[PDB]
Amino acid sequence: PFTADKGKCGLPEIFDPPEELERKVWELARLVWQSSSVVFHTGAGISTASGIPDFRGPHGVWTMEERGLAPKFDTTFESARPTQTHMALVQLERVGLLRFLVSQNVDGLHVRSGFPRDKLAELHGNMFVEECAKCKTQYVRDTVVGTMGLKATGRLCTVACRGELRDTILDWEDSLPDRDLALADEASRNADLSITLGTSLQIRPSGNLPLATKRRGGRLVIVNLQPTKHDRHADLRIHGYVDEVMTRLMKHLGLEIPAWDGPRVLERALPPLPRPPTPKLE
Ligand SMILES: Nc1ncnc2c1ncn2[C@@H]1O[C@H](COP(=O)(O)OP(=O)(O)OC[C@H]2O[C@H](O)[C@H](O)[C@@H]2O)[C@@H](O)[C@H]1O
Ligand SMILES: c1cncc(-c2nc3ccccc3n3cccc23)c1
Numbered sequence: 001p002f003t004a005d006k007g008k009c010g011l012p013e014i015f016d017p018p019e020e021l022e023r024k025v026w027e028l029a030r031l032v033w034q035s036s037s038v039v040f041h042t043g044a045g046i047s048t049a050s051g052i053p054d055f056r057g058p059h060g061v062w063t064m065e066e067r068g069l070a071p072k073f074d075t076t077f078e079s080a081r082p083t084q085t086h087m088a089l090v091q092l093e094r095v096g097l098l099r100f101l102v103s104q105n106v107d108g109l110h111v112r113s114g115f116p117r118d119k120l121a122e123l124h125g126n127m128f129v130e131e132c133a134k135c136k137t138q139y140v141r142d143t144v145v146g147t148m149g150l151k152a153t154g155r156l157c158t159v160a161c162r163g164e165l166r167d168t169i170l171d172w173e174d175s176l177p178d179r180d181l182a183l184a185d186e187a188s189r190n191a192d193l194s195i196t197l198g199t200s201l202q203i204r205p206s207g208n209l210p211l212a213t214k215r216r217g218g219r220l221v222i223v224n225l226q227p228t229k230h231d232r233h234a235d236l237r238i239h240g241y242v243d244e245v246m247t248r249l250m251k252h253l254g255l256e257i258p259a260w261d262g263p264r265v266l267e268r269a270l271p272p273l274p275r276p277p278t279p280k281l282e
């Protein structure tokens with residue numbers, strides 16, 4: 001816990017140059033077009049552009065701790081806005097181009113963006129969510145739940161129960177939530193394309209799920225500023241700011257990045273919207 005292995009922290013960033021970056025984002029569009037079933041895997045890197053520091057980046061939480069410095073937040077969790085990347089993922093699910101979203105972030109932003117919780121696995125918890133120890137009912141709150149480590153928050157269940165509400169933030173010893181891990185693993189195994197965004201992939205099992213997509217000849221794209229644990233397994237690695245990669249990708253796909261209405265919770269995915277017709281790929 002004080003000696004929990006924090007992994008490789010502070011590795012140098014890589015920047016694909018402008019013409020290489022454009023070529024690679026064209027190739028990602030091409031893979032999205034060809035794929036039947038696309039799964040996204042997100043980590044802390046997708047939220048850095050909203051003021052939330054990552055873990056293992058040059059100014060990440062664990063990196064700065066290793067140097068005796070403090071991470072810096074430019075927002076609260078409550079005042080954080082979803083990024084361009086978050087909103088792109090919203091739109092991709094609505095047009096049917098994303099099948100499932102697996103995230104390691106506890107920041108609450110995928111939920112707050114309006115992304116449907118039945119297409120989302122939150123592998124490490126959500127700081128806005130508490131759960132009834134008795135009936136298992138989850139409550140998505142407007143403020144951060146004040147505890148971590150699956151502790152009693154002090155509130156009680158209101159289902160038509162009085163069970164003790166607990167946080168969903170996993171500590172180092174806690175195993176992953178069974179439902180989320182099982183759904184994420186099924187999606188990952190059946191996917192023909194997994195795309196990783198702002199994750200160094202160092203944590204197991206979360207970081208290993210994209211590799212499951214490889215198993216029946218699926219493709220793996222990694223989008224990240226630093227090296228990741230599974231770079232040698234990638235069919236494509238794009239080294240660039242995720243918001244720049246995702247905006248360009250959406251432009252290639254013919255999709256707008258939709259407006260954020262403010263914090264909204266969608267339980268169940270809506271029926272799919274029209275999408276552009278697909279290019280001929282020779
Ligand atoms: N704007 C950006 N664009 C592209 N890449 C980015 C950006 N910002 C940061 N990065 C990269 O984004 C990556 C973020 O990697 P890590 O910090 O390891 O976060 P995780 O989500 O994989 O951490 C997994 C768990 O480990 C923890 O203990 C928690 O429990 C986490 O849930 C870095 O490589 C950055 O280069
Ligand atoms: C996402 C990105 N960077 C840092 C966190 C984080 N900040 C936390 C801040 C204070 C209290 C507990 C926290 N905490 C407990 C699990 C994770 C966190 C989340």
Ligand SMILES: [Zn+2]
Nearest residue numbers: 132135157161
């Ligand atoms: Zn209950």
